[PDB]
Nucleic acid binder design. Structure first.
Ligand SMILES: [Mg+2]
Ligand SMILES: [Mg+2]
Ligand SMILES: [Mg+2]
Ligand SMILES: [Mg+2]
Ligand SMILES: [Mg+2]
Ligand SMILES: [Mg+2]
Ligand SMILES: [Mg+2]
Ligand SMILES: [Mg+2]
Ligand SMILES: [Mg+2]
Ligand SMILES: [Mg+2]
Ligand SMILES: [Mg+2]
Ligand SMILES: [Mg+2]
Ligand SMILES: [Mg+2]
Ligand SMILES: [Mg+2]
Ligand SMILES: [Mg+2]
Ligand SMILES: [Mg+2]
Ligand SMILES: [Mg+2]
Ligand SMILES: [Mg+2]
Ligand SMILES: [Mg+2]
Ligand SMILES: [Mg+2]
Ligand SMILES: [Mg+2]
Ligand SMILES: [Mg+2]
Ligand SMILES: [Mg+2]
Ligand SMILES: [Mg+2]
Ligand SMILES: [Mg+2]
Ligand SMILES: [Mg+2]
Ligand SMILES: [Mg+2]
Ligand SMILES: [Mg+2]
Ligand SMILES: [Mg+2]
Lengths: 59, 118, 113, 205
RNA sequence: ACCCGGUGGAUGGGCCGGGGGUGUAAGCGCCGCGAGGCGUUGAGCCGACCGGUCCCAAUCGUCCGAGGUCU
RNA sequence: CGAAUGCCGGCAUGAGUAACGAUAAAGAGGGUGAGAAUCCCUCUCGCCGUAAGCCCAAGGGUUCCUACGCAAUGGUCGUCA
RNA sequence: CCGUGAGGGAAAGGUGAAAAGAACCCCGGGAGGGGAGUGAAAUAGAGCCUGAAACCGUGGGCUUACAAGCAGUCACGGCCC
């Protein structure tokens, strides 16, 4: 509401033509070492995922 | 630029950012394991390690230079008499950092874990 | 056979949700299930809930061998909005409209061939 | 036209006939000619070179150990020299006798998104008197209804630095063939460790 | 985006050595009624620079990706 | 009825953009919970302190206290109010 | 509801013939669905007759990344029905 303003109502085309990028990507997942559960890499997985320094397990 | 500089600015100013670390420290050396944002941790290492290494060499001057950051006699005590030991034959990395796979909700902050190795 | 599970009037803005309802269209309910669990978006949650619900309907009502069905179709629809008032500077006042979604998630049976 | 590659050690003033100062140590390590692009099979004349040896095998396939000199292929064979034809094997460093003149070509320092007035030295605004949130702006950029556009080359802010830059006629102060070392006259681009190349001065020769 | 690493590895953090910046820490001893001064001591502390070192972390894996139209 | 910067209603565009209301400031552990950066507890840190603390008057009119609860209200969250 | 006040002054009607208003089971904290059941009819399910248009979608056919655009029209050509 002021100085610069939209000259024309953008076309439905150009609108979605710019959102051609907002397309969301799928996470990056990998199988946990032990439990046959799926989980994102380099992370002390939500099911006892890791060895040595406590793996904040589900025990 | 703002090239070869090293040392996260944590959307905090001097006295805050500093007094922040001293509080991460006190926690970490009382509970042995703390959970924070991955970054807030990646920094905590060196601040603590130092505190600990100053503990091994542990004499009087070390007891004090260390106290300056913890202010608490006890704990400062528990660190020199029960923590320092466990590391006397370990040179470096007296601290660990392990990323968590879940993010704080209604915020979405990537988390991590911090425990004293060994 | 197929089984749907529509979550009506979910207080949340469509364009925000369609985002994820797009991450699981046509996938292994095992795949989907996973993706959602690990997707940083309020929407994830709501879609999951529905998804997991048609999963149940699949089993319980239409006999479908859980471990053999995918997301044949999914898609969220626009529901009546909530016109609230947002006071502005110089006695302006505006109508902020809290939208609401209608999330549909229908299931189908994978090959078996 | 003598080529050669080298990182860029550091800087430091020296001393010669009193009149101290002022060089840029840079090492033109052994550069194993790994190809010699012919004006028949290629159309022009040059010599792929290769630098830093290394690579205990990060070297995929292509590699090109073909030319029996590809000693565990260098990290950056990057670049040939052009109109250069060595002693068909490894460029010395002694290709340079002191007193000679050169040209260093390097990757300049990366200044990211740079405001105008660094990127171009624009005068900026007036720190006081009127002022008002234009203390560092580019001021005006065009005329009115005619032209009604902005010049194809109109200076403005943007990526600035981290571009291939060449500084010429640099005097070759010295050279230690033992350590592949080479000393010049400060004016040499890029950061330390970044790669640079050293030709013979285009000034004449 | 680009570039370099990812343990058959010195990538970052710690640690050690060196640069470098401060100006000779605390404790103790001595001199002074005392503020102080002297010594131990160029000490102590010490970001970013140059290196060394697997003590901490780059674990484990996953997904893409040609099989070449016609005279 | 196609135009009146027409009237009423509805839905678009700018746009996932500007914002989210003092730069006094946060950190962690443990609870509860279907669900916690946001609720309870404890330790640490910071802010006001001729108030950012207390007592009156006006005005307000149940906002007080307690039990059970989150659709909406709270500029996010909410098990809290 | 607006205004100190005189005064201004809205929006908002319809399930079915009869509540027969959806037992019970399943997912879910709920809301909400899926079955089941009522009904002639359930896109008659209570933010309920008919439910148009803007506007937001999902799927399919044709089409498009060397192209200059009041967006049509007139020709030929492919592809789909
Ligand atoms: Mg930096
Ligand atoms: Mg201060
Ligand atoms: Mg006002
Ligand atoms: Mg830079
Ligand atoms: Mg000026
Ligand atoms: Mg100003
Ligand atoms: Mg003008
Ligand atoms: Mg390292
Ligand atoms: Mg040192
Ligand atoms: Mg002393
Ligand atoms: Mg080694
Ligand atoms: Mg007319
Ligand atoms: Mg209108
Ligand atoms: Mg914009
Ligand atoms: Mg912006
Ligand atoms: Mg913003
Ligand atoms: Mg606020
Ligand atoms: Mg009340
Ligand atoms: Mg109360
Ligand atoms: Mg809320
Ligand atoms: Mg508000
Ligand atoms: Mg609760
Ligand atoms: Mg309560
Ligand atoms: Mg039902
Ligand atoms: Mg009807
Ligand atoms: Mg009727
Ligand atoms: Mg109707
Ligand atoms: Mg074409
Ligand atoms: Mg035409």
């Amino acid at each position: 509401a002021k100085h610069p303003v939209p000259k024309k109502k953008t076309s439905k085309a150009r609108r979605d033509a710019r959102r051609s990028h907002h397309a969301l990507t799928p996470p990056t997942l990998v199988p946990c070492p032990e439990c046959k559960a799926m989980k994102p890499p380099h992370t002390v997985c939500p099911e006892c995922g890791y060895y040595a320094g406590r793996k904040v397990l589900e025990v | 630029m703002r090239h070869l500089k090293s040392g996260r600015k944590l959307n905090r100013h001097s006295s805050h950012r500093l007094a922040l670390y001293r509080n991460q420290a006190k926690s970490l050396l009382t509970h042995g394991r703390i959970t924070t944002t991955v970054p807030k941790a990646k920094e905590l290492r060196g601040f603590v390690d130092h505190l600990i290494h100053l503990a091994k060499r542990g004499d009087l001057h070390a007891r004090r230079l260390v106290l300056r950051d913890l202010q608490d006699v006890k704990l400062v005590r528990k660190l020199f008499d029960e923590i320092a030991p466990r590391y006397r034959d370990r040179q470096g990395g007296y601290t660990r950092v392990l990323k968590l796979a879940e993010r704080r909700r209604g915020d979405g902050a990537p988390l991590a874990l911090v425990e004293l190795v060994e | 056979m197929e089984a749907k599970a529509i979550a009506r009037y979910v207080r949340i803005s469509p364009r925000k949700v369609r985002l994820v309802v797009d991450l699981i269209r046509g996938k292994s309910l095992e795949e989907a299930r996973n993706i959602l669990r690990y997707t940083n978006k309020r929407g994830a949650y709501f879609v999951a809930k529905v998804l997991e619900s048609a999963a149940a309907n699949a089993v319980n009502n239409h006999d479908m061998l859980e471990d053999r069905l995918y997301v044949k179709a999914a898609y969220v629809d626009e529901g009546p909005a909530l016109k609230r008032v947002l006071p502005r500077a110089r006695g302006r006042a505006d109508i902020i409209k809290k939208r609401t979604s209608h999330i549909t998630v229908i299931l189908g049976e994978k090959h078996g061939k | 036209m003598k080529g050669i590659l080298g990182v860029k050690v550091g800087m430091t003033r020296i001393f010669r006939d009193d009149r101290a100062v002022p060089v840029t140590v840079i090492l033109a390590g052994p550069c194993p000619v790994v190809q010699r692009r012919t004006p028949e099979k290629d159309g022009y004349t040059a010599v792929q070179l290769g630098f830093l040896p290394q690579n205990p095998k990060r070297v995929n396939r292509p590699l090109k150990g073909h030319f029996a000199k590809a000693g565990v292929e260098p990290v950056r064979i990057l670049r040939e020299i052009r109109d250069f034809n060595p002693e068909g094997d490894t460029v010395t460093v002694e290709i340079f006798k002191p007193g000679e003149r050169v040209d260093v070509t390097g990757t300049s320092k990366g200044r990211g998104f740079a405001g105008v007035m660094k990127r171009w030295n624009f005068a900026g605004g007036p720190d006081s008197h009127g002022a008002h949130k234009i203390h560092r702006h580019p001021g005006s950029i065009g005329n009115r209804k005619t032209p009604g556009r902005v010049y194809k080359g109109k200076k403005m802010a943007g990526h600035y630095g981290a571009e291939r830059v060449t500084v010429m006629n640099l005097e070759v102060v010295d050279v230690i063939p033992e350590e592949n070392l080479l000393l010049v006259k400060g004016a040499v681009p890029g950061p330390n460790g970044g790669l640079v190349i050293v030709r013979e001065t285009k000034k004449a020769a």
